[PDB]
Amino acid sequence: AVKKFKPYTPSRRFMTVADFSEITKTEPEKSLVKPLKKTGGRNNQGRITVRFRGGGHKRLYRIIDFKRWDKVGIPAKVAAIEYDPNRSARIALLHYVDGEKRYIIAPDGLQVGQQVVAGPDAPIQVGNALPLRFIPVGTVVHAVELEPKKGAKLARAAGTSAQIQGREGDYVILRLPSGELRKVHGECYATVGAVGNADHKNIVLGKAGRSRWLGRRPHVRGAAMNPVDHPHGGGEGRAPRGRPPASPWGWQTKGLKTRKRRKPSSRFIIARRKK
Amino acid sequence: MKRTWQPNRRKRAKTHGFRARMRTPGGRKVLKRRRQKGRWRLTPAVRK
RNA sequence: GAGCUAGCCCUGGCCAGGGUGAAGCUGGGGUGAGACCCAGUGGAGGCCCGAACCGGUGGGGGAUGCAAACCCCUCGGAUGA
RNA sequence: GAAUGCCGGCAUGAGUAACGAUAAAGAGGGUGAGAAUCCCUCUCGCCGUAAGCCCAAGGGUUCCUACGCAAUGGUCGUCAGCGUAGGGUUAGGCGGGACCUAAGGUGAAGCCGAAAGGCGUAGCCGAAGGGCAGCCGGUUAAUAUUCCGGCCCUUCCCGCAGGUGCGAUGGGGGGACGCUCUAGGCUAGGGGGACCGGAGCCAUGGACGAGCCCGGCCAGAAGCGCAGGGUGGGAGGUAGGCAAAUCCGCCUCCCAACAAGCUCUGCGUGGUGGGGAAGCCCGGGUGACAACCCCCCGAAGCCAGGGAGCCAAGAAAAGCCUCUAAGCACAACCUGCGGGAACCCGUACCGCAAACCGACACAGGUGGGCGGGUGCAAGAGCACUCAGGCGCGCGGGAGAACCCUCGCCAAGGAACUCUGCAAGUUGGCCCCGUAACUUCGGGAGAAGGGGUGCUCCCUGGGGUGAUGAGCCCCGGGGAGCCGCAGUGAACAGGCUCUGGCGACUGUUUACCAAAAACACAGCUCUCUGCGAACUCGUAAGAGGAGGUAUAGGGAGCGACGCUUGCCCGGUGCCGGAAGGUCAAGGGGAGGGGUGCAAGCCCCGAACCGAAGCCCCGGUGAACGGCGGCCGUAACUAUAACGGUCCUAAGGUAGCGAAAUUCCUUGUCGGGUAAGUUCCGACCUGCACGAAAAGCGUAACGACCGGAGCGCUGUCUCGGCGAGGGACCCGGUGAAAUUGAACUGGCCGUGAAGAUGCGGCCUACCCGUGGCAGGACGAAAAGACCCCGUGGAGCUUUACUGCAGCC
RNA sequence: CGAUGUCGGCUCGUCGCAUCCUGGGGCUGAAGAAGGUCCCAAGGGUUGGGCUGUUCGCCCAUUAAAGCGGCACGCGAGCUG
RNA sequence: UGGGAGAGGGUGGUGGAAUUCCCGGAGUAGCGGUGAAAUGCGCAGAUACCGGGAGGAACGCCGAUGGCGAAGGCAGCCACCUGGUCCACCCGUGACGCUGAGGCGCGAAAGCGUGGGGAGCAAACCGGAUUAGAUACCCGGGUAGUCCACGCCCUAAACG
RNA sequence: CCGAGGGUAGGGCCCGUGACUGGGGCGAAGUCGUAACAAGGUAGCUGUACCGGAAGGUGCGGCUGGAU
């Protein structure tokens, strides 16, 4: 439920923020958090290997549980639901009757104080983790493992999901958030339901500084640079691209596919993406 | 205005000091050369 | 060689005073319930005025200078990128 | 003898410019060979959110004392941050270490790279972050939370007693956190007192007074008092916290619940130790048995880890508490008391500056805290002052031009000029009032005006206190007084109308451009299924991201509104197992060299044979492109209509002499007495146009235009005045430049612009203050231009190659 | 080319005369007045404005008239920019 | 009070045909399209045939001169939340009624905003053909839209 | 004190006029086409959307004031 403001500043005209109504706890679990190193897009060599990054809000990284087969058959209770700044999605705190506490990501409609579970015999119920094969065909599902027991990889960001089209042997046919049809092992754990906070994309950042809060440093076009800096640099006055539109490093950025065409996982990709 | 020299004893020793030279191959050859020329001091003096 | 300078990282510090009065909350009206209206409370904001601080618009001086970029008068930002 | 040669010495300009903020000086008395310059007093001026005081960087004896003045000091010097010598820095409690972690650094394991070396989990290092136990006064010429005095606390060792399952680098808790706003109650600090203590003082017309002047506190252990913080107690189950675990986490039950109890903080008091003014007198002595009280203001600091709300969601680790594991329970741990033990390093001095950074005793730069009073609405603003500190290391005169900084101005009022450039104007507070337009916020402090002091009387409400007084904070009414003037000084918008460009706040060419440029939220295209794409790297490894398509890279555009048309022939990209072209490799028809021969050796066609190209499509918010001629209407004119060649397709809406229009000051209209600019239109648009976006857009702008009002020294057109210079005198004393010079005008001549040649003319010798026409004046071996088979940056369907990718 | 600063403006002039005005003349298709044209004459004079960087030019209002040229398109060790 | 009909409205589900697209099988020289034809698609293996797969939309027969709503309008099928209405009985209140300026609400299509979605259809646009021309009628493509959610628009041959 | 009115500043409504621009009405015999009345030669009309020299064409839904 995105929030509008009255236009009492030039930048409050369109700026929108999340509702935070599904939030029930306003501080993290001191046991499930750890320091988060702001890299600033600079690798171990020190050099900027991802441009235009840095200077955002300090955050604490909450440990998220992407391998839910760790605790099979132990009913955890949905303790609270908390803001996580390292994600688009929200996170739910779970109190396993084991006594262990864990953060999962909150699917849609999941309510505080409900029992969730994981395992082959789990119910098909929002928030439960079964191997892919044991989920009935035709059910939206988030937090999918790609390869078995390597971690939940697909369908994680806000509002995303993944449908199961059918089965075919040791593999199921998943329709990814991007409309791709990939085959994923049936023994791959997944969580039933779409990720919550779907209203996330409607957020209008509203002003430049808000992007600066998020660690996004200003982007400078190539057409504004000099030939020493960019294919698009130079020109007297303005100038069209004057060549195939290109990145700073030379390769063409309009249409040029870059997926490796000998990659092994191609054997498991039925159909490249939609739209 | 703010000139370029802004002395900082910790900066001085950790950049041009003896132990910073002996670590790298170049800084060793710096020491060899100055020890060959006959310099009185091979490293910048700073009273710490 | 990043003790100048550009950015980023970690850890601290700094921003007189005054103005405007957002949502919300309360009460009243309203309605089938509402939207909503009004009032008070409230104290939002790359909000407004203006020191420190950060700047450097216009003019004058300076031009073997006080100074290898300075001085005076004006002027911009000043809870924020 | 010449290389704008090299090194050095000495000249010239020259007794010239200058002697470093215009805060400012004067006299007396000392000292001494010598005094504007040092010492002392008196008087005057300057800073006072500093030009004062206290930390930290950095500097490194510059600190104090004696003795000096060659040089350093822009003059002088007896003086000094200068020379010579002597002296000076005292810690269990301040800061750092023997404690902890942060980025980063390093790095057993492990990984990688010709070598060198590069990484890398732990671990280690790393601080202005965490943790941690001293406050006040006195003393030295110079150090003091360090020596001393008073009253306090910490650790380690050993011991006695009491108590307990003791026990850790292991498990747990805690440490532990953001921005904005903010409650209660304190203190820091300050204002007043008619209360208390005090050397005194009565002036010059009055006052011997509730007169004036001065001061009226600081530190403190246990206990107690006020104000807050922290925190439930019990038991049952227990599979989780990588062994265990009575702790922690989860579940049930019991009672406690806004409390209370306990624990810890701050503030108050407190045994006690201190401090203690002006004035007078020679830092000290007095004062003085000094007094040490009451009321008020009151923090941004304390209680503190308080409270609220918000989104962008806010270090770590140790100390400390708890749980237990080996081990051990003659030990070991907790508590209380006693005795003993307690190391290394810093401590002088400067510190918005004459000691730091600027080659200088350089108007510049330099992080943190304290920063007193009154008035002006507030305040760290502004003026004046306390404490404190200064008068800026050349002076004395004179009273020209001219320069700077400043004041005023008759009539005019932008006529100045590229331009109101500059300088006026306006100026804060309260009340009245306030337009088109708009995104309903705004535009807006729109505009325009009224008020403002001092005295008297009447009065409303608040804070404290107690409900009163008293101080204190907001006011309201009536009547008066004075001046030219009542924010009477200082600090403090000129306004309006209309265009262009960019939505906006923001960013930029450090040192000529702050803009219309960059950025920006927002729209689109494209890429990317995660060991992602992409980037850095030889690699390992990093980033991306401990992210997962509502996500990440790249690119164009640039809030918002209404919109973005036609062309796929070329170029890019994407799709296409056919076809054709194609490399090594396969095949080996068929020949060749040799040899007695077996054989060895070489050439070798058809055919099989990738990617890439060819070829078939697609595709524009991919690179891009979007015609010409001829004719036609019942007045002329112009062509809705036709005709034809060409195209891949012939510019759509909307705009338009425009940041674009050459002809151009286009033509018409407005504004003006007059308008190459400006605004509105027209349209044969040299040469607009739709995300290198098209047409609008409220708001915004130190952007660029036009106009008007107000007001002016901008001007007609200049005058006077002030101070700092120029000028004269004493002191100190540069510079660039310079072939040598005994260095006139005209008219000619000359390498074509002559002080230097010819002819004529003029002219006694040397200066000083001035002005700049010349010495093709100085400065920089022309930046333009050319030249060189000179250089470099950038580009591409130039050549060639390399990485990368296929 | 081991540098001769480049338009215009301002300031300050100075010279030429092929004279815009003032003075003197002849001819006139000169009645007067007022014009045309030529001759003599450089003594003095030769305005203030709107527009544009402009010189120039147009325009407003005057005027006796609103002259044309040279002086390195006179003059940046005189200013402006 | 007890009963009844119905595509009335809203929500949530779900079922079969059909077309398009993708995959396999089989198969070969044309399919398509019209007044005729050309475009277009097909030896790179189309069309016609079988199986599998995904997806959207719409509900054949019943079906009617039918039924409901105040109108716009409403049609597979099941369930839930819900309106209107009629009939029996003659039980209850006792004129409590009718109309309705303003007000408020509803209001087909198309269109607009933000999201999703997209099979068929199809303004715009492209091409073939017709034609003097053909910015058309015919044919082959084709974008918005048509669908969903929410939020506007509020017009109509909104008619009996 | 009030006060005619004078002055300054900003509003509101009306009238007249304005380069140019928008359609409108009219006008004996203009140019282009043929949309409509017959099934008007694509049944018409409609609200809307979009396009086009022009009448109009088409998508969507609606009406019969539509023919056999």
Ligand SMILES: CC[C@H]1OC(=O)[C@H](C)[C@@H](O[C@H]2C[C@@](C)(OC)[C@@H](O)[C@H](C)O2)[C@H](C)[C@@H](O[C@@H]2O[C@H](C)C[C@H](N(C)C)[C@H]2O)[C@](C)(O)C[C@@H](C)C(=O)[C@H](C)[C@@H](O)[C@]1(C)O
């Ligand atoms: C402040 C102090 C500086 O003076 C200036 O800036 C003036 C204002 C320059 O004009 C500036 C400004 C400007 C507009 O001059 C009017 C322009 O000409 C150029 C850009 O230089 C001068 C004089 C230039 O001379 C000019 O050289 C020109 C190439 C041609 C001309 N010559 C023919 C005579 C001559 O005057 C030139 C080169 O800078 C001189 C050289 C030696 C310098 O660099 C010297 C050291 C200067 O930096 C300076 C003296 O310190």
Ligand SMILES: [Mg+2]
């Ligand atoms: Mg909003």
Ligand SMILES: [Mg+2]
């Ligand atoms: Mg609003």
Ligand SMILES: [Mg+2]
């Ligand atoms: Mg939420």
Ligand SMILES: [Mg+2]
């Ligand atoms: Mg932790």
Ligand SMILES: [Mg+2]
């Ligand atoms: Mg990271």
Ligand SMILES: [Mg+2]
């Ligand atoms: Mg590293």
Ligand SMILES: [Mg+2]
């Ligand atoms: Mg990058």
Ligand SMILES: [Mg+2]
């Ligand atoms: Mg970056």
Ligand SMILES: [Mg+2]
């Ligand atoms: Mg995310």
Ligand SMILES: [Mg+2]
């Ligand atoms: Mg979240």
Ligand SMILES: [Mg+2]
């Ligand atoms: Mg798999």
Ligand SMILES: [Mg+2]
């Ligand atoms: Mg967005």
Ligand SMILES: [Mg+2]
């Ligand atoms: Mg961004």
Ligand SMILES: [Mg+2]
């Ligand atoms: Mg962030």
Ligand SMILES: [Mg+2]
């Ligand atoms: Mg950009």
